[model samples]
Target chain A: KSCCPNTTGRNIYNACRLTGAPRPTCAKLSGCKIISGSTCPSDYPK
Target chain B: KSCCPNTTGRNIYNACRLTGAPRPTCAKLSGCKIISGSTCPSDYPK
Candidate 1:
């Protein structure tokens, strides 16, 4: 899911998507819309 | 949103299906990633 194709290991986990940090962190981050640079919210299907 | 005092509304919504969440609702979250808070993820386009 690397938006930029040229870079390897491009799939960098957002500050919110860590393994043991709960599944969907949307509740963790409230009010803030998921803009481009913001961390990836939980995962694809939450 | 305002996470401090004297805040009015403060743009709060994080139930995995509200402004902080999805407009309609998410597909249900699953996993183990605890943090300050936890919720579903589905506000973005599906």
Candidate 2:
């Protein structure tokens, strides 16, 4: 089965917000689009 | 200390929030594969 959608993104969002880190726009523009393997998807952000 | 992969971690996170659980505390007892992990107030595992 595939990983939960936006799980990493939301976690990153909370982490970033919690630690006051950068990389804004987590809630709006986030997620790896439902990963299915160890490697990130080609369309994943750089 | 080994933390959860974003996949399972996020699932727990979302599950906690979606189910109206609390943060950090919610993560505690968040078992693996969405139901197993570090025991009691889950912070880290070996």
Candidate 3:
């Protein structure tokens, strides 16, 4: 999977096209919207 | 886009699914296979 801040909504991972989806590592990070930040939250899909 | 060392050929970026391809940051990163390392090589697509 990948990681990207869902809160940003800008999609920094947009440049990476070879992969597919933004597999968030975690739900939150540094009190900010970071994919590779924390564990799965209630809203997290997986 | 994302960055991962292409030299290793292991594809460390495999975990970051959301980003997509392992968008190499540069062609040569610290003489290592690191995506977030260099500019662009001949083999680099973009």
Return the top candidate by TM-score: 2
Rank order (by lDDT, best first): 2, 3, 1
Worst 10 residues of 2 chain B by lDDT: B26-35
List, residue by residue over B1-46, the lDDT tens digit for candidate 1.
1121112112222333342433222222222122233432333211
Q: How good is model 3 by TM-score? A: 0.18
Residue-by-residue lDDT tens digits, candidate 3, A1-46: 3333353422333332223323232211112234444674444322
Candidate 1 residue lDDT tens string, A1-46: 2122222212322323442323234324322223455344443322
Q: Is the docking of candidate 3 incorrect, acceptable, medium or high quality?
A: incorrect
**What value of lDDT does candidate 3 attain over all alpha carbons?**
0.32
Tell me the interface RMSD of every candidate, in Å. Answer: 5.3, 9.6, 8.9
**Model 3 misplacement above 4 A:** A7-10, A17-46, B1-24, B27-46
Q: TM-score per candidate, in order?
A: 0.17, 0.26, 0.18
Candidate 2, A1-46: lDDT as tens digits: 1222446665654543453322332332233233457765444532
Q: lDDT per model, in order? A: 0.28, 0.41, 0.32
- DockQ (Cα-based) per candidate? 0.05, 0.03, 0.09
Q: For model 3, state the Cα shift of residue A3 in Å.
A: 4.2
Angstrom error of the Cα, residue A44, model 1: value is 6.7
